[PDB]
Design a protein around this ligand. Structure first.
Ligand SMILES: *[C@@H]1O[C@H](CO)[C@@H](O)[C@H](O)[C@H]1NC(C)=O
Ligand SMILES: *[C@@H]1O[C@H](CO)[C@@H](O)[C@H](O)[C@H]1NC(C)=O
Ligand SMILES: *[C@@H]1O[C@H](CO)[C@@H](O)[C@H](O)[C@H]1NC(C)=O
Lengths: 142, 49
């Protein structure tokens, strides 16, 4: 999972979000986007993941916000089975402020999986003065 | 400007209100009545701003 897209129409008619992790940083863009039908950065070979198709948007017209900061924890290579990482976020916009709360936990040894039990609290991460409307979101497999 | 400057614009017709500290840059024809407006400058279909 690379990031998320937030919006209401996603057809260059209304402004929209784009959050995605790359390189050793993060990029968050608020802009009018002409999003393609299928949103991915997967495809260039058979199996070794490639960051191909960097511009999932056909074009980028007048934007409003730009932001680059310290990225999140990264998992190298592709491993199947015994998934030791859990990452949980909450996303909410109120009063024109976008709040993202993030939490990371290691050493998940639950083979059956199905969203783990117990208890954990989430810390504030960042607040963005975006000031737009938001109705629907997706996830950016890439 | 002495002749008149039109760089400053205001939105006049809109379906609903604005939540606090929220920006709207959309520019689409606003339907005054029950009649469809597929994009026209005619009856009951007016520019928003
Ligand atoms: C993200 O970083 C990678 C590696 O530096 C680069 O190839 C890619 O173009 C970047 N994408 C964006 C949207 O910054
Ligand atoms: C993955 O793609 C890269 C170039 O994008 C290529 O060099 C590499 O051989 C590919 N790996 C596989 C397993 O196809
Ligand atoms: C945001 O967009 C939705 C879908 O068009 C709309 O129902 C809602 O009223 C909008 N929010 C506003 C105008 O504050």
């Amino acid at each position: 999972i690379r990031g998320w897209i937030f919006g209401t129409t996603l057809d260059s008619k209304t402004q929209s979000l784009l959050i995605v992790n790359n390189a050793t940083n993060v990029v968050i863009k608020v802009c009018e986007f002409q999003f393609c039908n299928d949103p991915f950065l997967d495809h260039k070979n058979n199996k070794s993941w490639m960051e191909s198709e960097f511009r999932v948007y056909s074009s980028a017209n007048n934007c409003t916000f730009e932001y680059v900061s310290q990225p999140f924890l990264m998992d190298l290579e592709g491993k199947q089975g015994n998934f030791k990482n859990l990452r949980e976020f909450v996303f909410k916009n109120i009063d024109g402020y976008f709040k993202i709360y993030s939490k990371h936990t290691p050493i998940i040894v639950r083979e059956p999986e199905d969203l783990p039990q117990g208890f954990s609290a989430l810390e504030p991460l960042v607040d963005l003065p975006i000031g737009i409307n938001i109705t629907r979101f997706q996830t950016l497999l890439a | 400007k002495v002749s008149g400057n039109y760089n400053y614009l205001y939105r006049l017709f809109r379906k609903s209100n604005l939540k606090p500290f929220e920006r709207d840059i959309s520019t689409e024809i606003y339907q005054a009545g029950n009649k469809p407006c597929n994009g026209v400058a005619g009856f009951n279909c007016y520019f928003p701003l």
